[PDB]
Amino acid sequence: VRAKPYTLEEFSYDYFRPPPKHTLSRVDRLWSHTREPLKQALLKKLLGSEELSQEACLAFIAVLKYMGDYPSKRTRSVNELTDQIFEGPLKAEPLKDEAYVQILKQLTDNHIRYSEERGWELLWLCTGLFPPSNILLPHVQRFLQSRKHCPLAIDCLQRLQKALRNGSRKYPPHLVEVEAIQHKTTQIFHKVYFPDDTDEAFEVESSTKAKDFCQNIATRLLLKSSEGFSLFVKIADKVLSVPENDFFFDFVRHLTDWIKKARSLTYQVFFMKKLWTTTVPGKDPMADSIFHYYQELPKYLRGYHKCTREEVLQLGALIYRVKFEEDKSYFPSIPKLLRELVPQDLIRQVSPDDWKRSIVAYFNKHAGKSKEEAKLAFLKLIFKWPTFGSAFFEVKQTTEPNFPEILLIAINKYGVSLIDPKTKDILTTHPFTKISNWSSGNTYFHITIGNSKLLCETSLGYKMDDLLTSYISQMLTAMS
Amino acid sequence: YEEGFDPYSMFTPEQIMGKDVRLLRIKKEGSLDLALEGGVDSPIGKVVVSAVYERGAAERHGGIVKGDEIMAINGKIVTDYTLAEADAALQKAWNQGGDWIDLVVAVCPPKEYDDELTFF
């Protein structure tokens, strides 16, 4: 005789609700598959809990619907039924074990092959959201270990381990997780976009946290440090940074959920330099090559910096070299490409051909330098400016009377700078150490200086708040 | 109608100095879908629109936008109200009594700066 696969029969005796008193009088096991909805939660613990038992029975009808054991429809979202199954356990700890025992029950002595294949998808989704309690965990493991022949059993055992390590998810499975398992694929690959107009596919798991994801990208790109780097999600208008200890799928799911309340729900994942504190051009070749040049270039071309005509001709000739190297066949194309070579505001100062003649003279001075050397030479010249590695915001200030109403705010390693938009002159720099408080709304951004208050009219207060928070935190932890 | 409203009957020249004060008489159909922010307590020290949702009533009227200042609700000045006081007054005007809501707003001027894109 060969050992039959493990069931929740022995577990049920102590932790499932007892059978109704009439059971023995009646001459369909609680721990086995049914098509009959629950009227009370499986776990003895939820017996008293009315609100929780109610949610446990709603999630079981969603488990039935998903598995084809209860009527439904040709459902709109691929995650409409899975949200109903897991929203309960994700908001309440007592429901986490109910989720596992419900799924395991529906996979025990299940005659229907279509049903059993669907229950496996649910257990795979469950193992990537949260682990079971310490009491249940061995039973879930013995259930999976005795069913190694089922194509998802070894993956569920693996995911359990990652769920015990990384902790629990907060939002239900993302549509990419649900589509992957329905398409019989346990491996997920997500595209990541870089400032050099390239992208790459990186493997992502349900347990993936932005910090791990960032470290895999950094390792791949041969960066000397992942410090100051961050994931960003570009959805609709919005471009948000992803918190270091947040689960990648929770951030995306929540952000897409939020956008759906105020409304194409298409997103892009970016990897970029967020904090520029430790950035020194020359130190890290790939960071300079992929990130620093490409991120500093549009800031420079918007006209956010104060520079001399000698510098704009030098940087102009340097940009040309990044684009075409030693090729002089794009020289007559300089007037047509001026918006790509000279800051916006200065273009009108000189005729298109006088710019062409001046840029052509400065290029020949950059010897026989490569596109890469030109990226470093550009970076090294701008690193001399106190506005290097800044995040610039155009605001309407309401508190300073001697300062213009329209200001340019630069947030960098030195603090918060107020710049005159016309002269590009820094009026004041408030170090992070002198910033005692800050707040934001949809229409503003506020900062308190010392024991001085600054109020900015902006729709970008969320971003400024994030940068101020991240820079102050970075410094404060570095002071330990 | 709303085109025949004098803000000087309600406010002093100093109170509405440089402000473009208008009367909005919203229809009163379903959800108002208008969010507020600020309050007398807050850094902005006034009640402003934080969002006008695409669904309707405030959007369907079209007179009100994010950043506009709420000055009066059904004749009662709300300029020194807190955010919770303003939200309560707005909801109570929408739910309790009448076939319309009367909002006195200071129309926010156009943004004389790029308030969209950010380079990190």
> What are the residue ranges spanned by the domains of chain B?
1-120
C-alpha span between A247 and A253 (Å, rounded) = 10
Interface mutation vs chain B, best among A406, A409, A442, most B CBs within 10 Å: A442
Interface mutation vs chain B, best among A301, A420, A443, A460, most B CBs within 10 Å: A443
CB A406 within 8 A of CB A396: yes
3-class DSSP state for residue B110? coil
Q: Pick from A273, A396, A443: which is nearest to B37 by CB?
A: A443
Strands of the sheet containing A198-204, edge to edge, are A198-204, A188-194, A267-273, A229-235, A239-241
Q: What are phi and psi of A189, to 5 degrees?
A: -125, 130
User: A5-23: buried (b, 16+ CB within 10 Å) or exposed (e) per residue?
Assistant: bbbbeebbeebbbeeeeee
User: Residue A403 corresponds to which amino acid?
Assistant: F
Site of tokens 């549009």: A298
Q: Pick from B44, B54, B119: which is nearest to A444 by CB?
A: B44
Q: Where are the beta strands (DSSP E) in A124-279?
A: 188-194, 198-204, 229-235, 239-241, 267-273
Exposed/middle/buried for residue A261 (C-beta within 10 Å: 0-12, 13-18, 19+): exposed
CB B46 within 8 A of CB A398: no
Q: How many angstroms separate the Cα of B30 from the Cα of each of A435, B34, B35, B64, B100?
A: 45, 12, 15, 17, 11
Q: How many CA atoms lie within 13 A of B119 on its CB side?
A: 21
Tell me, what DSSP letter sits at residue A416? E
Chain B residues with beta carbon closer than 8 angstroms to that of A258: none
Q: Where are the beta strands (DSSP E) in A362-425?
A: 391-397, 406-412, 415-419
Exposed/middle/buried for residue A446 (C-beta within 10 Å: 0-12, 13-18, 19+): buried
Q: Is B1 in CB contact (< 8 Å) with chain A?
A: no
C-alpha span between A121 and A117 (Å, rounded) = 7
3-class DSSP state for residue B21? strand
Record: contact A391-B119, CB cut-off 8 A: yes
C-alpha span between A41 and A19 (Å, rounded) = 12
Measured over the CA atoms of residue A445, residue A449, residue A451 and residue A455, the dihedral's sign is: negative
Q: Is A439 in CB contact (< 8 Å) with chain B?
A: yes
Q: Is A258 in CB contact (< 8 Å) with chain B?
A: no
CB A308 within 8 A of CB A326: no
Tell me which fold the domain B1-120 belongs to.
Pdz3 Domain (2.30.42)
Region of B67 on the Ramachandran plot (φ > 0 left; ψ -120 to 50 alpha; else beta): left
Q: Is B41 in CB contact (< 8 Å) with chain A?
A: no
Which residues of B, range 70-99, sit inside 8 Å of A by Cβ? Answer: none
| CA distance to partner chain A, nearest, from residue B1 (Å) | 30
C-alpha span between B41 and A381 (Å, rounded) = 47
In 3D space, the residue among A331, A381, A385 whose CA is nearest the CA of residue A360 turns out to be A331
Tell me, what DSSP letter sits at residue A433? G
Q: Where are the beta strands (DSSP E) in A172-266?
A: 188-194, 198-204, 229-235, 239-241
User: Residue B56 corresponds to which amino acid?
Assistant: G
Measured over the CA atoms of residue A454, residue A455, residue A458 and residue A464, the dihedral's sign is: positive
3-class DSSP state for residue B71? strand
Chain A residues with beta carbon closer than 8 angstroms to that of B48: 441, 443
| A&B contacts, CB < 8 Å | 63
Q: Is B38 in CB contact (< 8 Å) with chain A?
A: yes
Q: Is A72 in CB contact (< 8 Å) with chain B?
A: no
Element (H, E) at B73: strand B69-73
C-alpha span between A249 and A271 (Å, rounded) = 16
CB atoms within 10 A of CB A153: 18
User: Residue A230 corresponds to which amino acid?
Assistant: S
CB B39 within 8 A of CB B83: yes
Record: contact B37-A441, CB cut-off 8 A: yes
Which tokens is A2 given? Answer: 């060969």
3-class DSSP state for residue B77? strand
In 3D space, the residue among A232, A130, A119 whose CA is nearest the CA of residue A172 turns out to be A130
* Residue A114 Cα to chain centre, angstroms: 35
Which tokens is A329 given? Answer: 């066949």
| CA distance to partner chain B, nearest, from residue A19 (Å) | 48
Q: Which residues contact A233 (CB under 8 A, 6 or more apart)?
A: A239, A240, A242, A251, A252, A255, A267, A268, A269, A270
CATH number for the domain harbouring residue A110: 1.25.40.530
Record: contact A299-B119, CB cut-off 8 A: yes
In 3D space, the residue among B52, B101, B39, B97 whose CA is nearest the CA of residue B75 turns out to be B101
* Nearest C-alpha in A relative to B48: A443
SS3 content of chain B, % helix, strand, coil (to 5): 15, 25, 60
User: Residue B70 corresponds to which amino acid?
Assistant: I
Q: Is B100 in CB contact (< 8 Å) with chain A?
A: no
C-alpha span between A46 and A452 (Å, rounded) = 55
C-alpha span between A252 and A232 (Å, rounded) = 10
C-alpha span between B80 and B40 (Å, rounded) = 5
Tell me, what DSSP letter sits at residue A16? B
| CA distance to partner chain B, nearest, from residue A295 (Å) | 7
User: Residue B16 corresponds to which amino acid?
Assistant: I
C-alpha span between A295 and A392 (Å, rounded) = 12
Site of tokens 């629950």: A38
In 3D space, the residue among A342, A349, A436, A447 whose CA is nearest the CA of residue A400 turns out to be A447
C-alpha span between A76 and A275 (Å, rounded) = 41
Nearest 5 degrees, angle CA A235-CA A239-CA A245?
Answer: 100
Q: What are phi and psi of A417, to 5 degrees?
A: -110, 140
3-class DSSP state for residue A23? coil
In 3D space, the residue among A29, A36, A34, A37 whose CA is nearest the CA of residue A11 turns out to be A29
Q: How many CA atoms lie within 13 A of A246 on its CB side?
A: 18
Q: Pick from A272, A295, A458: which is nearest to B115 by CB?
A: A458
